[PDB]
Amino acid sequence: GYQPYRVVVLSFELLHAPATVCGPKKSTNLVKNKCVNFNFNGLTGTGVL
Amino acid sequence: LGKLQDVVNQNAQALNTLVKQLSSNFGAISSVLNDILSRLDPPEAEVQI
Numbered sequence A: 001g002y003q004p005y006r007v008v009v010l011s012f013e014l015l016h017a018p019a020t021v022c023g024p025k026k027s028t029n030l031v032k033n034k035c036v037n038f039n040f041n042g043l044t045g046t047g048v049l
Numbered sequence B: 001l002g003k004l005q006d007v008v009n010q011n012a013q014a015l016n017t018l019v020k021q022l023s024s025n026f027g028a029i030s031s032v033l034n035d036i037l038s039r040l041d042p043p044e045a046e047v048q049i
Helices: B002-023 B033-039 B041-047
Strands: A036-040 A041-045
Touching: A041 B033, B033 B041
Parallel strands: none
Antiparallel strands: A036 A041
16 A cells, blocks of 8 residues: 555547547458448448448 | 418427437437447446447
8 A cells, every 4th residue: 555556547539530549450341332331440330331 | 271281390390309319318428329339348338228
C-alpha cells in the first residue's frame, strides 16, 4: 500500500470520423450488389452495397 | 374531406413515432444493437440488451 504503483489510462475516443489507429486485421476485396456481411472500421452489418 | 384525411394522419403519425422509438437508449449505453454486441462480451451485453 505505501509503496507506489504505476498506472496508465488508455482513453479511446470512438469518434464517428476517420480512424487513425486500427487493429492488425487484414482487409479484403470489396464486393457489391450481393447480400454480404460487411465491416467498416468496426461498424459491422449485413446488407447490399 | 377532413374526416377521412384525419384518419390517415392518425395512423401515419403513430407509425412514425414507433420507428423513432428505435433511437432511444432507454438506459443502455447505445441504441444500436450491433454496437453493443461488437463492443461487449455476452456476459456484460446481456444487461445492456
